[model samples]
Target: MEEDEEVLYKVRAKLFRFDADAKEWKERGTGDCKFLKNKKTNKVRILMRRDKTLKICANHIIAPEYTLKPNVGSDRSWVYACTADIAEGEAEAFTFAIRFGSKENADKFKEEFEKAQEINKK
Candidate 1:
């Protein structure tokens, strides 16, 4: 029997990153973002799509350290994830952020993402 790939959660969230070189915030257009699980390999994937013709970047064996920040007196919130390049021996850090439409959604995604991280650890 073949195990099927499973998607834990899917959402359209605004992505932003701080450009170190440019010293500014760069917006990566809204896209279909989701947490996908491969039952065969027991691995989880992060998939994002901002354009129809653009290619998708898949990061395997991902274990991102993330934080959730909720704004006071507002529904808007942010979730940030950072990964270090241990594979290259340089240990460079890269950070990414997702701005949600509501604090509820941000919390949901953060919980789901952490769950996925636990799954990846196993």
Candidate 2:
């Protein structure tokens, strides 16, 4: 029998951070998974697994976005995001997707992803 192919799961969440500089509003979080971090603070972060070696990271004061384009051997697609606040001149609010080992894994991942998204929503 042929081995099963991996699937992609949509992971989503929101994060928050504390900003001492902005005493008035130190908390930030975006319901959008694109915002890896809180959109109003600077102490928390959200992260998405990229490839085996990379991860999509965002601070606490940004928005998150994602694209679920179909690949050559995939059966389904999804999108996810987070928020962030990085260095004055750095990239934030990065979006990406995670690949699973099999369709079952993908389904499990989707369930977990949705659960996390719900629990982490702000």
Candidate 3:
């Protein structure tokens, strides 16, 4: 109901990644994470890019089957598991950690995320 790849929500946050091999979460990029909806198709997805190179850090369709864990272990962060994160010229199965500037900011994003989640389903 907006622009081509409508942005339902957008917030500045640092995007990280965690792997079983890696001991801790690693920062992939720091920029704005947004919920983009295809205007004509009526589908929503999370799209994020880095600051300088503007690399596409996170791009994945929003689906109920995907894992969306809120505040996994921190107050202003979230660990959301996704099947595939389309980045650059490739797509990989990666779990993302998004840390916002504040608690409420993160909450607002989650709220919009889940809100868009519902609309995509319908």
Candidate 4:
């Protein structure tokens, strides 16, 4: 089970990235993302892929060192500052924000995120 992983949380959402060169928030993708536990690391992280291309857009360990900030005036969205290493082929900087279609989904995401953080600490 070298490549096996466990899903801790799953949700449907659209991801956004703030482009520094263009100075605007851009659409990253709309797809299902998950928090998974890696066998080697024994920790969890987000794994989101683009809808059409199936390219992973957002991925990184869920830890307290990084705060998942809530988006302005919207409980359904949260701004993610993450590490894009594996999919992008190199680590880069960007605003990796995600939107949950409903407040229920968003709230649930937050709860699971906190739980994931707790798991990460253990």
Question: Highest lDDT, which number?
Answer: 3
Candidate whose TM-score is highest: 3
| Residue lDDT tens for model 4, 1-122 | 21578988889998888888887888877898899898777888888887878888777778756667887868898886765435475777666778888989988998898888888998
Whichever of 3 and 4 has more TM-score, that candidate is 3
Residue 64 of model 1: what lDDT?
48
Stretches of candidate 3 off by over 4 Å are: 1-3, 71-73
Q: How does candidate 1 score on lDDT?
A: 0.64
TM-score for candidate 3, residues paired by index: 0.89
**TM-score of each predicted structure versus truth:** 0.70, 0.35, 0.89, 0.86
Predicted candidate 4, C-alpha RMSD: 2.1
Candidate 3 residues 1-122, lDDT tens each? 23577777889999988877967888888888888889778888888888988887888888867655776478988887877777755777877789999999978877887888888887
* lDDT at residue 58 of model 3 (Cα atoms): 80
Predicted structure 1, TM vs. truth: 0.70
Q: Worst ten-residue run, lDDT, model 4?
A: 80-89
Each model's lDDT:
0.64, 0.36, 0.81, 0.80
Task: Flag clash pairs in model 4.
Answer: none
Poorest 10 consecutive residues by lDDT, candidate 1: 53-62
